[PDB]
């Protein structure tokens, strides 16, 4: 299955794995792996970016590595070539001193609007994504 190939790789590369209960899976990606791993996910078959959700952790009780984190939802849509129907989540923490992330508009067209709504709400600049 396309899912296990992402988790088996997640352990192999050292990414944290959250198991919200369950069938929904989180893959925490450092900013250094983000741009390449996302394109790798598209190459693996995750041809649909369902949702991008930002997060401000300043009010939640327990702390996070950084204040900001941006959540990505990847789907391998039903249909062909061999759309498995797979779905998982990609989280990457963003430091509030350097609130920048690589864009994925060159990977999924739905990112242009999704990355814009996160920018307007949280001020997290996505480089390459055109603004002005």
mmCIF file of C-alpha atoms in Angstrom:
data_model
loop_
_atom_site.group_PDB
_atom_site.id
_atom_site.type_symbol
_atom_site.label_atom_id
_atom_site.label_comp_id
_atom_site.label_asym_id
_atom_site.label_seq_id
_atom_site.Cartn_x
_atom_site.Cartn_y
_atom_site.Cartn_z
ATOM 1 C CA UNK A 1 0.000 0.000 0.000
ATOM 2 C CA UNK A 2 1.108 3.581 -0.650
ATOM 3 C CA UNK A 3 0.647 4.458 3.038
ATOM 4 C CA UNK A 4 3.131 1.954 4.471
ATOM 5 C CA UNK A 5 5.745 3.077 1.936
ATOM 6 C CA UNK A 6 5.542 6.552 3.491
ATOM 7 C CA UNK A 7 5.765 5.288 7.084
ATOM 8 C CA UNK A 8 8.456 2.680 6.426
ATOM 9 C CA UNK A 9 10.381 5.581 4.896
ATOM 10 C CA UNK A 10 9.404 7.876 7.782
ATOM 11 C CA UNK A 11 11.151 5.577 10.256
ATOM 12 C CA UNK A 12 14.084 5.050 7.881
ATOM 13 C CA UNK A 13 14.621 8.815 7.578
ATOM 14 C CA UNK A 14 13.929 9.571 11.248
ATOM 15 C CA UNK A 15 10.660 11.468 11.036
ATOM 16 C CA UNK A 16 8.280 11.515 14.013
ATOM 17 C CA UNK A 17 4.975 9.716 13.506
ATOM 18 C CA UNK A 18 1.763 10.677 15.297
ATOM 19 C CA UNK A 19 -1.150 8.239 15.360
ATOM 20 C CA UNK A 20 -4.329 10.170 15.940
ATOM 21 C CA UNK A 21 -6.792 7.353 16.504
ATOM 22 C CA UNK A 22 -6.796 6.151 13.785
ATOM 23 C CA UNK A 23 -6.256 5.465 10.146
ATOM 24 C CA UNK A 24 -5.224 9.134 10.148
ATOM 25 C CA UNK A 25 -1.446 9.456 10.298
ATOM 26 C CA UNK A 26 0.915 12.385 10.845
ATOM 27 C CA UNK A 27 4.452 12.615 9.449
ATOM 28 C CA UNK A 28 6.475 15.416 11.056
ATOM 29 C CA UNK A 29 8.936 16.782 8.497
ATOM 30 C CA UNK A 30 11.823 19.127 9.300
ATOM 31 C CA UNK A 31 11.977 22.180 7.054
ATOM 32 C CA UNK A 32 15.171 20.795 5.512
ATOM 33 C CA UNK A 33 13.362 17.756 4.073
ATOM 34 C CA UNK A 34 10.029 19.446 3.362
ATOM 35 C CA UNK A 35 10.339 20.560 -0.267
ATOM 36 C CA UNK A 36 11.984 17.343 -1.469
ATOM 37 C CA UNK A 37 9.795 14.984 0.575
ATOM 38 C CA UNK A 38 6.602 16.625 -0.697
ATOM 39 C CA UNK A 39 7.690 16.232 -4.321
ATOM 40 C CA UNK A 40 8.657 12.652 -3.476
ATOM 41 C CA UNK A 41 5.115 12.172 -2.162
ATOM 42 C CA UNK A 42 3.684 13.447 -5.453
ATOM 43 C CA UNK A 43 5.994 11.048 -7.294
ATOM 44 C CA UNK A 44 4.782 8.243 -5.016
ATOM 45 C CA UNK A 45 1.220 8.875 -6.203
ATOM 46 C CA UNK A 46 -0.199 11.513 -3.843
ATOM 47 C CA UNK A 47 -1.461 13.649 -6.717
ATOM 48 C CA UNK A 48 -3.937 15.702 -4.654
ATOM 49 C CA UNK A 49 -3.276 18.291 -1.940
ATOM 50 C CA UNK A 50 -6.569 18.248 -0.058
ATOM 51 C CA UNK A 51 -5.904 20.918 2.560
ATOM 52 C CA UNK A 52 -3.270 23.166 4.135
ATOM 53 C CA UNK A 53 -3.943 24.246 7.728
ATOM 54 C CA UNK A 54 -1.734 26.532 9.808
ATOM 55 C CA UNK A 55 -1.380 26.416 13.574
ATOM 56 C CA UNK A 56 -0.499 28.855 16.357
ATOM 57 C CA UNK A 57 0.558 26.866 19.424
ATOM 58 C CA UNK A 58 0.804 29.803 21.841
ATOM 59 C CA UNK A 59 -2.418 28.876 23.686
ATOM 60 C CA UNK A 60 -2.281 25.068 23.776
ATOM 61 C CA UNK A 61 -1.022 23.783 27.148
ATOM 62 C CA UNK A 62 1.985 21.645 26.227
ATOM 63 C CA UNK A 63 4.818 23.146 24.149
ATOM 64 C CA UNK A 64 6.020 22.390 20.630
ATOM 65 C CA UNK A 65 9.495 22.667 19.052
ATOM 66 C CA UNK A 66 8.375 25.937 17.421
ATOM 67 C CA UNK A 67 5.394 28.238 17.871
ATOM 68 C CA UNK A 68 4.036 27.770 14.335
ATOM 69 C CA UNK A 69 3.356 24.566 12.409
ATOM 70 C CA UNK A 70 1.733 24.158 8.990
ATOM 71 C CA UNK A 71 -0.272 20.984 8.330
ATOM 72 C CA UNK A 72 -0.588 19.522 4.825
ATOM 73 C CA UNK A 73 -3.152 16.907 3.759
ATOM 74 C CA UNK A 74 -2.106 14.651 0.873
ATOM 75 C CA UNK A 75 -4.505 12.383 -1.027
ATOM 76 C CA UNK A 76 -3.964 9.833 -3.807
ATOM 77 C CA UNK A 77 -7.299 10.451 -5.486
ATOM 78 C CA UNK A 78 -9.368 7.507 -6.775
ATOM 79 C CA UNK A 79 -8.987 7.054 -10.502
ATOM 80 C CA UNK A 80 -6.072 6.139 -12.713
ATOM 81 C CA UNK A 81 -3.157 5.847 -13.140
ATOM 82 C CA UNK A 82 -3.803 3.676 -10.059
ATOM 83 C CA UNK A 83 -5.115 6.133 -7.517
ATOM 84 C CA UNK A 84 -4.983 4.145 -4.295
ATOM 85 C CA UNK A 85 -7.271 6.370 -2.246
ATOM 86 C CA UNK A 86 -4.496 6.892 0.302
ATOM 87 C CA UNK A 87 -4.424 9.835 2.696
ATOM 88 C CA UNK A 88 -2.057 11.060 5.405
ATOM 89 C CA UNK A 89 -0.836 14.324 6.911
ATOM 90 C CA UNK A 90 2.429 16.264 6.777
ATOM 91 C CA UNK A 91 3.347 18.608 9.628
ATOM 92 C CA UNK A 92 6.350 20.945 9.647
ATOM 93 C CA UNK A 93 7.194 23.267 12.531
ATOM 94 C CA UNK A 94 7.974 26.887 11.668
ATOM 95 C CA UNK A 95 10.033 29.159 13.958
ATOM 96 C CA UNK A 96 8.441 32.534 14.617
ATOM 97 C CA UNK A 97 11.793 34.243 13.986
ATOM 98 C CA UNK A 98 12.022 32.784 10.450
ATOM 99 C CA UNK A 99 8.353 32.291 9.343
ATOM 100 C CA UNK A 100 9.160 31.004 5.855
ATOM 101 C CA UNK A 101 8.491 27.702 4.097
ATOM 102 C CA UNK A 102 9.079 26.351 0.586
ATOM 103 C CA UNK A 103 6.000 26.563 -1.592
ATOM 104 C CA UNK A 104 4.419 23.535 -3.246
ATOM 105 C CA UNK A 105 2.503 25.498 -5.880
ATOM 106 C CA UNK A 106 4.897 23.905 -8.391
ATOM 107 C CA UNK A 107 3.603 20.511 -7.179
ATOM 108 C CA UNK A 108 -0.130 21.055 -6.579
ATOM 109 C CA UNK A 109 -2.141 23.915 -8.043
ATOM 110 C CA UNK A 110 -4.477 23.886 -5.039
ATOM 111 C CA UNK A 111 -1.584 25.190 -2.918
ATOM 112 C CA UNK A 112 -1.806 28.698 -4.411
ATOM 113 C CA UNK A 113 -5.060 29.441 -2.595
ATOM 114 C CA UNK A 114 -4.309 27.184 0.384
ATOM 115 C CA UNK A 115 -0.923 28.793 1.047
ATOM 116 C CA UNK A 116 -2.575 32.212 0.687
ATOM 117 C CA UNK A 117 -5.187 31.629 3.399
ATOM 118 C CA UNK A 118 -2.433 30.528 5.790
ATOM 119 C CA UNK A 119 -0.341 33.583 4.890
ATOM 120 C CA UNK A 120 -3.180 36.035 5.531
ATOM 121 C CA UNK A 121 -4.087 34.450 8.870
ATOM 122 C CA UNK A 122 -0.635 33.616 10.260
ATOM 123 C CA UNK A 123 1.882 35.638 8.233
ATOM 124 C CA UNK A 124 3.877 32.555 7.202
ATOM 125 C CA UNK A 125 5.534 33.522 3.917
ATOM 126 C CA UNK A 126 5.758 30.784 1.280
ATOM 127 C CA UNK A 127 8.767 31.497 -0.926
ATOM 128 C CA UNK A 128 8.218 31.264 -4.681
ATOM 129 C CA UNK A 129 4.482 31.701 -4.208
ATOM 130 C CA UNK A 130 3.744 35.089 -5.834
ATOM 131 C CA UNK A 131 2.227 37.743 -3.589
ATOM 132 C CA UNK A 132 2.052 41.462 -4.564
#
